[PDB]
Structure formats: structure tokens, C-alpha cells
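Q: Joint fold for the lines below.
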Amino acid sequence: LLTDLVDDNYFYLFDLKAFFTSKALNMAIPGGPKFEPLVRDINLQDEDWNEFNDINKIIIRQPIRTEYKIAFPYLYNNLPHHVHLTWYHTPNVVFIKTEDPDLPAFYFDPLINPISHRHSVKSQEPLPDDDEEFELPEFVEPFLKDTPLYTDNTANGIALLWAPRPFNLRSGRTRRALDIPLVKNWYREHCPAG
Amino acid sequence: PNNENIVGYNNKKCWPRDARMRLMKHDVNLGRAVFWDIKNRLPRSVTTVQWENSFVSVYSKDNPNLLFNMCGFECRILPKCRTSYEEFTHKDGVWNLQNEVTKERTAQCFLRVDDESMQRFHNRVRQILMASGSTTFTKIVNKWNTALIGLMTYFREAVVNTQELLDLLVKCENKIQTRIKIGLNSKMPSRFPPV
Amino acid sequence: MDFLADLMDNSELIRNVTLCGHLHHGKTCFVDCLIEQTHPEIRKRYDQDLCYTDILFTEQERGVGIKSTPVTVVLPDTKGKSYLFNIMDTPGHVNFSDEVTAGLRISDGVVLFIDAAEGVMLNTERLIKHAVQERLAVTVCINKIDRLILELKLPPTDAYYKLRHIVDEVNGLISMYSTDENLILSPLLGNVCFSSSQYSICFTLGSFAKIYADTFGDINYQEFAKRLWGDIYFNPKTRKFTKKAPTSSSQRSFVEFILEPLYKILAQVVGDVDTSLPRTLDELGIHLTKEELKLNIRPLLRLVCKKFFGEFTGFVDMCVQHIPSPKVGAKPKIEHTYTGGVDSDLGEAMSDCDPDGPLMCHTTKMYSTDDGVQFHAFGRVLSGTIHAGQPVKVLGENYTLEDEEDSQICTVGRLWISVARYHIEVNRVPAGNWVLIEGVDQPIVKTATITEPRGNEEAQIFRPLKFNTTSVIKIAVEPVNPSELPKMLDGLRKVNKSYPSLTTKVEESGEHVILGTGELYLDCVMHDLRKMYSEIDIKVADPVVTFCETVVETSSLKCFAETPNKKNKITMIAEPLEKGLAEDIENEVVQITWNRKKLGEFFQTKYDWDLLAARSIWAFGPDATGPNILVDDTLPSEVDKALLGSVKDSIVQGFQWGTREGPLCDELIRNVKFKILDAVVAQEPLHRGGGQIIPTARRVVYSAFLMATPRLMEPYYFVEVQAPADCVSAVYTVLARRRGHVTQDAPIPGSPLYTIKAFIPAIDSFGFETDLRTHTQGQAFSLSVFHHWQIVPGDPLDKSIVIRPLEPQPAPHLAREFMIKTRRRKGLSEDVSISK
Amino acid sequence: RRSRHCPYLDTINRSVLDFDFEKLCSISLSHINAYACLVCGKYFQGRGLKSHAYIHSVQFSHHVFLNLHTLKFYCLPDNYEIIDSSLEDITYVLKPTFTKQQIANLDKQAKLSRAYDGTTYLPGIVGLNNIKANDYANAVLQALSNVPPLRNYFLEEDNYKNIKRPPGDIMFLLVQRFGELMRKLWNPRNFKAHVSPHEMLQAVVLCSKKTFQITKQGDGVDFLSWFLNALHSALGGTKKKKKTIVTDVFQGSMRIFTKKLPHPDLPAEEKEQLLHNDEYQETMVESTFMYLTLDLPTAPLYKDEKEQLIIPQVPLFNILAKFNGITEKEYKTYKENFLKRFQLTKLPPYLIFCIKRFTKNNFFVEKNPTIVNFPITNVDLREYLSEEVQAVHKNTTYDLIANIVHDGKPSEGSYRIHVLHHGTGKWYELQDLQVTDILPQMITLSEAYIQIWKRR
RNA sequence: ACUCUGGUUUCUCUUCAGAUCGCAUAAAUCUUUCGCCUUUUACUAAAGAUUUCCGUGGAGAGGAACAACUCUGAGUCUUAACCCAAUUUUUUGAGGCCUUGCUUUGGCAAGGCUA
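A: Joint structure:
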């Protein structure tokens, strides 16, 4: 019943603000809904030919799609009233889910591209000159030396961070069964192809 | 200085954007100049000419279409040299204007029923329907027939290109048929024979 | 805040810091952490990220930094010594590099924020280059280190490898851009911070060793910090650090002592909050209440790290030990930015940074009021003290010692110390500080220089901002109601004031033009212009880039022009410049101020130019650094040099005007070399005035350019795309439709995301980001910046080309269509006859 | 240095030199160092090299320029100042200068001022321009133009330049620009016979909360009230300046006597019982006034006894029956009725009459067509004044000097003003830019809307 | 390791609700624009303003249950084996004498003498 998504980059120009802008612009997102024209039914829809609208001065490279007019509304159309600015971008959540629980929680799986250490590449960085004067006291140790690096709950707990709202929070308030739409996240996504 | 000559300018909204008059700076200025010149030579006390009730259309390098509304017909002339690849005679309401001296076709008048005449016919149908409480079916249909042929025999060629009029004729015909049906019985028939 | 006011008077305890980096790298979140440190009543919400600097509603709705926000706070260091930090939160989006440039001018050092999961992104490299070229101290703050733990799940050794790789790449970039050896950045030197602004993690080696010292004791944290990095393994047997690993599985000192504890702290909370978390907190000395252990995992991580790491002292140590104070950094600042230089009497006076002396305040940013009616200039006080109610002389950008007309006398109103959402109203501000100034709005457009109204006549202005990018995207604007044109013009001047890189100009056809860097930049400009300021409906034309004109071959005819009195004749030809010469001229590699000997030596050595031709250079480009060369090739035996030199200034001015406004369109002329072959000059000085030579010089420049085979040059964007492995094909498909070719697609080390580098035309880049994100389901994000000018395919002057009304033209028809439609929009004639 | 050697003086054409436009560069949209070309009349950027003015000079061969700020003439292609007494007239048109000697005798001279175009005109009778039917603003400004004390106060820029202004205040734009417009109107050497107040209109629009816009006309009385209040407020400085020029000229004092009336259904005995309560007793309120609002009687609803509709006629003293102790005027609010009496206490030196021609009925807004018969040369208000204030006010005779007349329907309103040229008995009707000599008898036959009277 | 601090659950009631009352989402009425139009009752779909309904939070009050069980916070958060001092006080070599100035005298001020 849940969603495989880890961030809201999938809902780019396909979120509540984007649909509000669409409806206010009397424009239809290809996968989005359609509404009747807003109160500005005949505001500038039938604007006649003009020296400012002259198609002879317009250079055509790629047609200005509705997505362009919704992503940058104040730039790509006139009269953007009751228009909501959609969220621009969130950094790509790069969480790597683990299929086999036997593998360590902190692990360099093949999905991660290897890091070139390049120690042979010429690179000189400051060194302490092997000064024997500084010696750590015998009673100092790295923090949490006794505690292990990871437990059996570490991977599952990390996976709970990148989870939908009911499962990313450890405590909440009870809701009546009516208020839980189990399929609301299904039609909020794009309709599958074919 | 602010280029406001385009604000109050009137053009025929009946035609598409690329079909009506294009509102360039030079030609809008020329049209307003022509109207001002014509209005100047008429004394205000004797008569007057209002810009709002007037329509001024130009034809230049920046306007391939000439627009005017004469006797309820909205005509748009388009020379064969401008935007016209070749002539199609399949369209009924297009007049093949022909150069008399050279005996050759040079332009095409695209006819269309004026919106004022549309509104006049619709109001006539509304008046017929309203005065039908005691009117017999024969008199209602006779008034319909008279008004309809008065419209059609006038705009015989211009109705076909006028898609808004075709939908209006059907709507008015269905309205008077519904009037007769509800005069017959209160409940609407599921299907009522045209015979 | 009395201690804050008293701290302003000590220039040694002041840090002017600019936070810079790529888009969404934690700069704003870091400033939020600092404010939360200094303001107990301001606390971030559990789920909604506090954005204290993002005060604009556009920034809040878009979630992207747009304008720089100054923050002045008192931040204690490791030793508890409080300082006064002037922090600029520059936007990270590449389209808003103007705000970064404005911030760098009034700053002495740079804190570069880099995402830990991401590598060194496009804006990171660009801002590194800009900060190095602006002569500022560079310090790195590798942010979002939590990603390597809770998101990438890398082992601590691999996290160290990723951090080391980031540091190495930054060091390589700095070495490539700079020459100074002491610019090496390393956490051992204290130049690098590792931080997680989301979970309030911030530490250097020094601060974390200080944590050890405060916990264990009898440890020299300064000496211990010098061992907590690099391949310096720790030997538990001898309790000493060795460059050789004592055991086979021995870890680095950084991994063992820093990365392992961090991983364990971030792993006992996200997974083991229920059991073994109180034990770990007791082992760390952290105590949390019953109601604080009930928080969700992310607020719990933030609280635990705030308890364990406490205040932000490693960042303060970085900015104190490496970013110079205004007194220390004043001399390079004056040497770089001031026109007169440090040699002048004021230049010597500026280096002292005396709070009492000649007031010279340089403002690079202008912030609007709530209603938008009034603007407050913001800048650094480089000498003297400004006061409220004090009249000032407000120099412009064209102000010189001769004209003295660009300046204007104004009365300084209320003064403020700006901290994002609130401002501390002050009565005076000493030198070396940042101040909000009111009552100075009218004479200030873009940058400005403020001096005392009387007593200072040597005062020149500071050099205007040299932005890292050129605004090439052009949009036309007209009001819906033509009667409201004055309101739109007022809005245009307001947005010109509020945007450093904005350029509002009027074409000969009356079309108002706005120049921008990208889609987001112009979208924000238009949103401002509509909502604030003008408060009227405005129509926007389809965006169109600005072109440049060049010649691909030498002119086949010796073009000539004559003055109206026909007493002067100039013969000139135009040929293309050598490859890379225009770029060198634009990049200020060679200047007009150079003596002729060094210029000739450079041109002969690096370009194989003849000594006679190299020493005959007269002027450069439309402007001082314009990419055009005027060479006096007249034979001395034929034309007298002294007679010719009498009109040298006039012909140079005509050349500059002609290269500014090209023949083909009203566009800049680029990459063209002009040779003066024959120049008949009248002897009487009345007939050889400027009003005669300048139009003749412009006409001969036009004729020489037209006869030489002309071409249109269009701007090309450089695009960096963050996409996974499976989305690279979609990026290729999208770039193919827009005349874009890919130069590099390399995987990011330490991340599964790829980086595709490609060049796209700026006129085919409209909607490119939207198409890329739609076709890849939002998994491919791209940033575009102007890189270079490229010749448009086809022949611009081919009159046989037929342009369709609403159809894209083929490649051979691109140049002709571009020139015709540019001329139509400009309001010029239909085509340019070669005769003119 | 080579002044007086300029050969481009003859190139200057004074016909196209209109300084009524906003001083902004034609390309850079910058108000700083705006240079006005004396050949084409356009404004440009600056004198230096690579400036818009410098490029324009070497492009159209326009070699003469004027600095709109420093009132200096420059030849940018050569970059040398032009100093000559022949061009002093242009600077006077751009920035008129009025001395005390010229101001004092400005009301005692009668000569046709000579304009460059060849059309004669007079100072102070110049008609303003209309921009999208803003005739109300022009009428109000001309009404204030005919006022000598306000004009003299605004003819000297130094009279208000050195006052204290709040840092966030914008009301001062209504003072300096108004003074500039006053100087332009009374310019004896103006190039044209008309003045177009573009900058003044922008100041009015900006200072107002988008009220009284240029595009849409507004009520004359409301605009005049706002203008007077803003002038009083702006000139008040960073303090409460009780005695300003506007206050000393137009502001007077009247006493309001209010007697609350009980509900009509209340019995007479209970009404008398409530008469003991101070709520329904007379209450004295002494409040100063900027103008006097005269309310016309209701227009006739039928025809006369001779089956011919007659234009209503009312004497001036009949609508002046207000503001005295005898007349009691009922105020029907939405809740309760009041009997508000008015008693004049302090006649201002100049009195402003605002006849309420436009009242909104239960469904729409109607205009009262009642015609007021008023002598324009001798009216005495000593009778309306109290016996206590008639001793101090030894002067009560008022002479009409201006009369704003509204004609037509409220929607298609047209504003015209009949100004009185001081020093002559002639009356001038100012309709937009048109100035027409109107006989004194014809003024009283028009629908008077706003009137100004001088004590003298 | 000291002493005082004094709950949780549940059922009602009265009020206040900013806040996603509600990570959910209905209906009715009115006024505008339409769509159907031929009249109710249903409606078409946008906007605006209301009301009702299904629920919710805080605070206050009154009963009941586990009322007896402990918290947290504050309070000073209160102890001896063997080992120690050149930067602030139980190990710290810091003593005395004289000169002359000066204070009403006492003394003070500076310098010199050491061992």
C-alpha cells in the first residue's frame, strides 16, 4: 500500500501548488486534472494581433509547453493571478535500501560508485613530523568504544527515516478509520504507462 | 507618447486572430488619423461620428485582410497575392471577386452573418415564444417560418460559414418545438415524431 | 546587544564572512543553526526547516535562495572569546551569482559549503574561481556529513575517503585558479569544517579534540588536532601516532577517533533509541528529559548533537584563524577594488581602517522596504564612521575626478545593523563593518561609494562588480494598460536597483528590455516587478537571447569613408582575431593601461605577432576589455603619425561605438580585428573635430565589418546534470532535440548519481530544465550558466532564405531568421544593405 | 573654456523644448544627470564618454545640450560649457525664479505674456492639460492658483525647502512639485500657453493610496479636501505645526450645536422626561473647518403651475441659512436622528464653498441641478456670525475669485472653472487647455460646485 | 549521597480555538458567472460569503478509578587508603639596614647596602 519514493522530486509540476497554478491559469497538465476556466474567463484569452504579440518577431525553437508556463509562471505567460510558486527542488535523496538483512548496516554496495583514492597521484599534505613528544594518555579512548558500530536495528531504523509519514514517526495521535485514505498516494502519482 | 491608440481600437472579433485586423503602430495611427480627418469636416452641431460606434480597417504590408460590415454582412476580403495559395470553390460562402479588366480572380470575400443580425433573430424568436400563451400552434409555426425565411433568403450564402448561426437556428427551432410539445402535454415526450 | 555594539569599534574582533556554495548545500541551514545558537527564543520546528535568512516570500515558496541576506552575530570561539561575525548568506543557484559577487566585494574571506553526498558541483567550482580571483581567503565547510551515514550508508573508511577526495578536488581547483602555495586547504591546517546543518553538527579537528580534552582531560587539543587526519594511524600499544598502520585492520586517526564515534552516535539514535540509547548518552555525558526522549528520530538526532557538540566553535576557529580581519585584509581589498589604489593618500588611509577618519563606505547591495517605495543601501564601511542625520557625498559609477557630476549630496537617515528578520537601529557605525543606510536610495544604482560631503576631493570610486556570468537572456515587457507605462518604468528602475546583474534598456522601437541570466532569474524578476513595485499587470514577450556579430574572413575590399566636409578619408579593413585572443582580452589578461613594450612582447611571444604590428595597437573592443582590436597599420612613410594622432581619440571613440552597435543588428561586435590602412587627416583643427571623425569612424567600421564575411554568434550554456545511471539516456534524448552535445558523463565518486556535462544553445535552453525533470520523473536536475559565444550556423546575409511564420527553421536558415527577427524586434529596417 | 564661440546656438529650436515631462533618460531610465537635447527635445543619460547623450550627439549631429539639474549648457562632442545670455530664457522656462519684488506686484499688472510659439497668454490664467479626463484635478489646481497667499508661499522654493521631513515621509512631494507647478503657471516667459502637470499627477497618485487616479476622474470636493489636508500635513514638519499657510489662509472655525432626538414612537411625557437627561440636551463642539459644505434644497419633482418644467433657483443666502443659530438641520443617520446646529466663530481670510451637488440616493448617485443665485462682488456674512465674534471680525465682505462648475451627468462629468484675473475685472473660463473670456453675469447661471472668496 | 516536592487513568460539564481544529473531507443556503433550459424538486461548475453536520485541540470545573505508588525539579548534589608543587593562596629561598624627600609627629615616598 505504500510508495517507493524517497523524496518529493517525483511530484515536480505534479503537486498541489502546480495543480492550483494550472487551475488558475486555465491550463491542463498532461496527467493532471481539468477545471472550468477561472473567474478571468475572457480576460486576455482572445487578445488580437499586436506589434507586441507579432509572431514575425518571435523566434521559434521549441514550443512553450504548459509545463514551462507552470514551472515559471510569472515569466512564461501574462496575467498570472492566483498563481502558486511550486517548490523548485529538493536535493536527491540518495538513500540505498538493503535487500539482504545479513549484510552490515554500513556497507559499500555496488550501487555506490567507487571512490578513487589516488594516493599515487601527486598530493602532499601536512604531517606531524613523527613528533614523539605527543603521546596519548593510557586512559583515553575513542568515544563509544564499547558500543558497536551497528546493531540489528540500525539498518531498519535508518530505513524508517526515508519512509512515508505514518512509518517515519515513532509516536502520534490516533485517527478515526475514516480519515485514513489508503489509496490517496496511488492517484497522486502519475498513471502507469499502457 | 504611451502608445494608447490601440486601447480603444475596435476590430471584428468574429474572425480568428490572424484573420481580423492586425493592430500595428503605423496602421492603427493611420486609421485613427483617417477617422479624425473625417470627423473634422462634420460640424458637431449638425451631426457627429463616434469612434466607439465606428469601425476602421486598413490593408497594408502588415494587414493582408480588409474588414467591413455592410448591411448585416461581415465581409473580409483577402487578395490572392496575400496569404492565399490558390482558390477553393468548395466553400459556399466565399465570393470569388474577379478583376473585370483582366477577367481574372484576384480576391475572395469571406462572408459572415453579423452578430447584430444574430441577436435580432434570436430576439425575434424570443418574442415569438413569449407571445404564445394563447397563440395557436399554427400561428407560432407561421411566425417561425416567416422569420426563418426572412433571415435565410437574406443571408443565403453567409449562413453556412457562420457556425454560430447554425447552432442558433437549431436551438431556436428546438425551443419552439418544445413550446408546441409543452402546449400539447405537460410532460415532455421521450421521442416526438417530426411528422 | 550592547556588547555587540562595542565589538564593532574593534576591527581586530570583526570577521566579514561570505557563505558560498552550490544550490541547496546547507548555507541557509548553517546560518539558522548559528542564529539558534545565539537566539534562545528562535527554535527550528520539528519537521519544517527553519529558514531565518530566507525572508522573501518567493524564497520561502520556491525553497531556493534568491538574494543575499546579511547576518551580524556575536559568535564565541573555542577558547570562549566572543567575536563579531558579519555573515553573508549568498544564494547558491548559478543564476543568482550576482548576489554572490555583491557579497564577495564587502567581504574579506570565504566559507565554501560543499555537500558531503555530492562532489564539487558547478557552482562550487565557479565560486571557488570567483573568490580566488577576487583575492579572498578560502575556507571549506563540508556540510551534510549525515548523508554519508544515514543516507549513503558508507563504512567510516569510505566516508573518510569521500571527504578526502572532496578536499583534494577543492585543493586542485584552488591550485589551478591561484598561484599562492599557502592556499592549500586541509582540516589539519584548520581550513576545513565537517558539519551537518540539519542535525546541528559542526566541528573541526581542533574543536573535537577540545571535546576530548573537556571529557578526558590532560590532552593538548591543539597538538591532538594535528594528528586527527591523514594516514596517521594510532598505535594503542605505544599510545602514539605513526604513519604506518600497527595492525592489518588499523584505522586512520580521523576514522578511529572522529568518524567511528559519529557513526555510533548517529546509529544508536536512529535504530536503538528504545534500548541502549540512554546507556550511550550516559557514556557521552548527555542527559535528556523524559519528554525529550519521546521526540522523533530526526529532532532527537538534532538534540543529541546539540548536547554533544554544543556551540559552533570549529567554524569560528576557521573564520578567525584564516579569514583576515578588516584591518588585516584592508590592504589587498584596496589594492584590488579601489580605482586609485593603495598608493593614493586615501589608499594609505584605507589600509589603516581607522574608525575616525575620512568616511568612505562602499555599497554593493540595495534592499527594499516593506512597501517597496524606499531602498536601503548596504555595504562595508572601509574608513571613518558614518552617523545618522549626517550629510554625505554619494558618488556614482561614472564619477571621476574630472566630471564630478555622477555624485550627489544626501542626508543619511536611520542606520541599522541587519540580521535577517530584524535590524539593530544604531546611531553610528565604525570602519570595517556592514551597515544598512537609508536616505541614500535615489542617487544609488547598482554599486556606489559614499564619502564625506566636503573636505575629500581625492576620493575616487570603487571598481564596479565584475560578475562571473553575462546576462544574455532578454525578455520584452509591456503593460496590459498602455496608460500605466510610468508605473512599469518605475518598477523597471526598482528591479534594476534590487538586482545587481539586471540590465533594463529601451530599444529604438520603444520596446523595454530586461536582461537576465536564466529562467529562474527572470521569473523572480518578473514576479517582483508584478507583485511589488509596479503593482500593475505586465505582458511578457517570449524570451530571446542576445547575439553577437563577428567576421570569419578578411574583408575583400579596402573600405573607405569620408567626413561630411570631405577633408578626411579613412581606409579600414576587418579580419577575425586569433583563437583565444578575444577571451584573453575579456579576461583582463592584457589591459589598455599596459605599456606598449610589454604588450608587443606578449603579442609576439604568445601570438606570433610582428613587432611593427604588435606595437601599433590603438584600442581594445567596445569597452576597456572589449573583445575587439583596433590596429593602426598605416605606413609612417605615407601618413604623418603626429597629424594622424591628433584625431586618435575621436577615431577610437567611433570604433568603440561601432563595435558596440553592430551593422547586422544593434548587437555587440566580437572577435574582429580592425586595421587602419590609409587615413588622410586634415591639418586645420576645426575640420577634424570629434563630431566629424566619430561618425566617419563608425561608418568605416560598419563598412569594413560588412564587406568581411559576417556571422552571428550566439551564447552557449554549460549544463551540469545530476542523474542516476538509468536517466543518462533520457538526458541524451532531451539534449539532442535542442542542439546540445554532451562533453562528459562521469559517475560521481562516492555516490550512485552521475554527472553529465553538455553544451546547449541559450536559445534552445528555454524549458530545458523542465523537460529534463519531466522526462526523468524529477531524477535529473540541471543548472545552466553562460560559457562561451558560438557562431550561429548559416549565412545571415543570404537573402534567398525564406523564413516561415511559426515554424522552426533548419540549421542553414538559423542565422538569417535570427538576424531578421532581431532587426524586427529592435525596430530597425527589414534588412541591412551592404552599401550602408 | 571656449565659451561664446559655439556655432550651434541657431540649431536650438525652442518649439520642441517641453520640460513638463519626467526627467528620465530615454534609454537608461535614470533620473541622475538627465541631459535634455536642445535639437530634438529628448532627455538622455550624461555628459561623459559612452553615455547615451554623448552617443546621441555624434549620431544625429545634435551638438547642443542642457543639464536639467545644474541649468548648464554643454557641447558633448567637444565637451565644453556654453555660457551666454541668449539661452537664459530656456533656463527660466525650465526653472522659473521669482523674487519678492516680482511676487508683490504680480497682482497689480496687466499685460499679455509673450510665448515662443506666437500665441499670447497670461500668468496665472494658463490652462492645464487633460490626461484621461482628469479635469477635476486641473480645476482644483487652478482654483488654488488664483489664491494669492498660497501662490506667493509656493512661488518661493526656499519657503519650504529647509523644513524637517520624516525619513519615511512622501507627503513632501505634494509640496515641492506643487510649488514647481505654481511657478510654471505664473511664468511670464513660458514657451507655450499651456502647462502639463505630469510629475504633479504622479505625485498625487503616489501620495494617495491609489486614489484620484489619472485614468479615472474623481470627485472635485474630495480631491480638494485631500489635497488641502496633505499640504497642511506635509508642511507641518516633524511636529504639530498648528499655524501653516493652508491653515492661515483657508482654515476657519465653526461651533457645532448637537441635540439628540428621541425615538418618534416615544410618548411626549417620556420625551420630556428624557429632555432632562444630558444625552438629548444641547452639546457644544468647537471644531475648525477647511471648507464650508453648503447643501442645496431638493430638486423639484414635478412641473410648475404652467405645465413647463422650470430650472430650480435658490438665493445664496438661502443655502447660507446654514451655519447660524436659528437654522436647525436634521441629520438622519442609520440609527438615530440629530439636530446639529452650526455657528460660525472665525472667518478665514479666504473662504471655500463646497456645494454638495452629488448625493447618493437609495439606489444610485444623483446630481442636484439647482442653480444658486449669488452676487460675485459683495456678500456680507456678519449676520451669520455671533455677537461675540463680530467685534473681532471687523471684515466680512467676500469677493468671488474662482468658481469650479460641474456640467453633465456624474459619470460623464466635465469640470470647468471661472477664474478672476487679479488687477482686472475680466473673468476667464478655463476648460482644459482652452481659455475663454466670460462675462461676469454668465458665471452665476452655471452649476457652481466649488467656490473661493477673498476678504480683501 | 542527603531533604522537600505529590501523580496517572477514566467519565461528565463549561468555555476558548489561532493551528493541515481534521496530514481527512461532507451537505445545505445565499449572491454572482455560466451549462441545461420548460415549471417545482433535483441539478451542471467555477468564484464569493454563510450555516449545519461528522470529528479535534487547549484551558477550567466536577465525579470515579490504582490511591497509594513513585517521579522530576529544587535544596548545596555531604566520605577516609598511598601519592605533590616556581605563575595567584599550609612547606616556598620576599630578610634587615640606610639615605634623602616629606607628614603637625607618627609614617609615607624614592634610592642605596645585601648574605
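Q: Anything notable?
A: The longest strand of chain C covers residues 710-723. Chain C is about 30% helix and 25% strand.
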